[PDB]
Ligand binder design. Structure first.
Ligand SMILES: Cc1cn([C@H]2C[C@H](OP(=O)(O)O)[C@@H](COP(=O)(O)O)O2)c(=O)[nH]c1=O
Ligand SMILES: [Ca+2]
Length: 129
């Protein structure tokens, strides 16, 4: 997999973010994770966490997996990095998302994320508290 540049347009919620990619505005949906909706428990904390990560970053990158790059809603599907740190993994490690939506062919970082979730679970963080 390869990292490609993008710039933040705006935070949306725990697992979606508006980025300019190849000069076009797009909503990105983070691969392999599920954050609570804003209206659900830990939703606001997940939204805030993703926001801080992407707003504080000097450099946002997107990394598509090997499979589909857009979902049925036109959202880009990617791993998103903030100064080289993966947002998807960071949410997992903090107990602010669950590994989910693991579809064959777009699951390169599955075990990395499951490992983070396990440590969050062990630590009883947030969703696992
Ligand atoms: C993460 C992800 C979600 N989706 C779709 C499946 C779900 O369809 P349904 O809307 O029919 O449930 C939806 C979940 O996204 P959200 O969690 O953002 O709602 O997005 C993909 O198709 N591929 C993906 O990789
Ligand atoms: Ca969600």
């Amino acid at each position: 997999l390869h990292k490609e540049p993008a710039t933040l347009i705006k935070a949306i919620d725990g697992d979606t973010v508006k980025l300019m990619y190849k000069g076009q505005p797009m909503t990105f949906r983070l691969l392999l994770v599920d954050t609570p909706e804003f209206n659900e428990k830990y939703g606001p904390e997940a939204s805030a966490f993703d926001k801080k990560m992407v707003e504080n970053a000097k450099k946002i990158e997107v990394e598509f997996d090997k499979g589909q790059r857009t979902d049925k809603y036109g959202r880009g599907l990617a791993y998103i990095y903030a100064d080289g740190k993966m947002v998807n993994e960071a949410l997992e490690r903090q107990g602010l998302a669950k590994v989910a939506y693991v579809y064959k062919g777009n699951n390169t970082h599955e075990q990395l994320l499951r490992k983070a979730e396990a440590q969050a679970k062990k630590e009883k963080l947030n969703i696992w508290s």
